């Protein structure tokens, strides 16, 4: 037995936490990313990068702590602890936002490790690897949003911060500056996510309400056995119900479950494509025909133009605080605003 | 427009019921993807490599079309044994309950922000 | 040289449900993207 | 409205071509 086979045997032992070869990448990187996030949200400020308190130590709460993006001055520097910025100084590395690339890169490699784990375990137990394929969607989201978007922009500063309110800020930023809601790729993402939730709810309810009477208890949960060969709910009854209620119904179980995979995954992939577009400011910001008409016709008003006005307001009022490195000085009189407000 | 004004006036993003709605829909999509992928992954071989695997299932067939035990083995090794459902009925109840509860909470969030009890 | 029948050729199929699903997908994609095509 | 002069052709083809692809495949099915 060669040493490689012996190692392979040890890594793939049946234990409470499977390790595998993929574990060598997953567990250290995932632990680094998680511990980095926890450390930053507990102890680390964003005073020098954003002028914000972002840790429990500073008095922030769960909703307002974040591992904030690094200072815009560094561009897309990877900000290694040993890099030319921190130069091995851990305190300075924390202060310049070095924890953000730490978490982002370790999380990217952890995600790779987790999907490799899906592949490895699928191969070991002898099933098709569709779980890894489904997980490609979250990977596309993470790559586009946390890497490609800031890479197309001026710096990592404009990446989403790892935090609840940081993410909320990123969301509102994308609305105001990119008109992200108007983006058809985002609308396909929304369709996929809401459709996935709908499919989850409707399938769970349909199964639970077409169950066969296989026990005597009012508690129907123990009238199932994992090794039983027969279906536990009536597909025929479900199909008739949905055909008469909704007009159409699934008749193929396999197609049903592939659809439940397909819808949210495609939603994630389409939204990731849209985010890639936004990385280069290739926005679906305006409808030029309506802009031109409004510019020449002061009685043409649509919900689109109203939303454009909202975006202008958000940008002007938010930019000085959101982008402190720019030293934006917008005097009170240049701020757009409606009457009396 | 409705959503943007709503956020401006109620801070719905910082409302825990809307956070529960987001958990509802994100998690519902997550569980839809997992359930579909685990069932598709554990399909019993009934077709050839040419035809769609969907033809391996016949409408109204009594037998099970996938191996739930193999799906449980895979998932309980992906995370750990006791986090994996092996009872299809409990699994499907969870699939129904998660998005429904999340959406109930977010509906109540909007309904209570209707009375200007706003987000944090 | 001789022209010999290729034994790797296979029929393609699209069942009626697949047709309805594809037609709906195409129609809704058109609905979605037409506004942006017109701009 | 001053819309893109390629909008009609783009939208019509965007719908039409996949439509005839599906129609061809469906109609020939079972041959």
């Amino acid at each position: 037995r060669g040493w490689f086979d012996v190692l392979d045997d040890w890594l793939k032992r049946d234990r409470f936490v499977f390790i595998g070869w993929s574990g060598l990448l997953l567990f250290p990187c995932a632990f680094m990313a998680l511990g980095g996030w926890l450390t930053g949200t507990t102890f680390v400020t964003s005073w020098y990068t954003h002028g914000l308190a972002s840790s429990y130590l500073e008095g922030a709460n769960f909703l307002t702590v974040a591992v904030s993006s690094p200072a815009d001055a560094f561009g897309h520097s990877l900000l290694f602890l040993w890099g030319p910025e921190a130069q091995g100084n851990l305190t300075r590395w924390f202060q310049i936002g070095g924890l953000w690339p730490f978490v982002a890169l370790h999380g990217a490699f952890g995600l790779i490790g987790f999907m490799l784990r899906q592949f490895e375990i699928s191969r070991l137990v002898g099933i098709r690897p569709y779980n890894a394929i489904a997980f490609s969607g979250p990977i596309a989201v993470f790559v586009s949003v946390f890497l490609m978007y800031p890479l197309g922009q001026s710096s990592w500063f404009f990446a989403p911060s790892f935090g609840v309110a940081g993410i909320f800020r990123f969301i509102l930023f994308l609305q105001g500056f990119h008109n992200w809601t108007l983006n058809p790729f985002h609308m396909m993402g929304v369709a996929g996510i809401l459709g996935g939730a709908l499919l989850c709810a409707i399938h769970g309810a349909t199964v639970e309400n077409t169950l066969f009477e296989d026990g005597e208890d009012s508690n129907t949960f123990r009238a199932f056995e994992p090794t039983q060969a027969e279906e536990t709910y009536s597909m025929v009854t479900a199909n008739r119900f949905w055909s008469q209620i909704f007009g159409i119904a699934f008749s193929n179980k396999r197609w049903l479950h592939f659809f439940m995979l397909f819808v949210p995954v495609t939603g994630l992939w389409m939204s990731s494509v849209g985010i890639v577009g936004l990385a280069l400011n290739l926005r679906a910001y305006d409808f030029v025909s309506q802009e031109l008409r409004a510019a020449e016709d002061p009685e043409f008003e649509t919900f689109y133009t109203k939303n454009i006005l909202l975006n202008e307001g958000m940008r002007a009022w938010m930019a000085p605080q959101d982008q402190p490195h720019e030293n934006f000085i917008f005097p009170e009189e240049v701020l757009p605003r409606g009457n009396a407000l | 427009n409705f959503m943007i004004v709503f956020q401006a006036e109620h801070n719905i993003l910082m409302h825990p019921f809307h956070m529960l709605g987001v958990a509802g829909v994100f998690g519902g999509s997550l569980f839809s993807a997992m359930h579909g992928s685990l069932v598709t992954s554990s399909l019993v071989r009934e077709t050839t490599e040419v035809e769609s695997q969907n033809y391996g299932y016949k409408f109204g067939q009594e037998e099970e079309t996938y191996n739930i035990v193999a799906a449980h083995g895979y998932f309980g090794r992906l995370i750990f044994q006791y986090a994996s459902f092996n009872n299809s009925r409990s699994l499907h109840f969870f699939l129904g309950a998660w998005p429904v509860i999340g959406i109930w909470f977010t509906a109540m969030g909007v309904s209570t922000m209707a009375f200007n009890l706003n987000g944090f | 040289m001789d022209r010999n029948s290729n034994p790797n050729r296979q029929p393609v199929e699209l069942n009626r449900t697949s047709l309805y699903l594809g037609l709906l997908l195409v129609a809704v994609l058109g609905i979605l993207f037409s506004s942006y095509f017109f701009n | 409205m001053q819309v893109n002069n390629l909008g009609f052709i783009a939208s019509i083809l965007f719908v039409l071509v996949p439509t005839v692809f599906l129609l061809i495949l469906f109609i020939q099915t079972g041959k």
Binding site: - | K58 | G30 | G7, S11
Partner: peptide
């Protein structure tokens, strides 16, 4: 005249719905 295009695509989707309901492939138990 882009109104015509919008109406056209919407009508296409609706017609697909009616045919998918009325002229669906019947589920058959066999």
């Amino acid at each position: 005249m882009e109104s015509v295009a919008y109406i056209l695509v919407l009508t296409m989707a609706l017609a697909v719905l009616f045919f998918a309901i009325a002229f669906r492939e019947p589920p058959r138990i066999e």
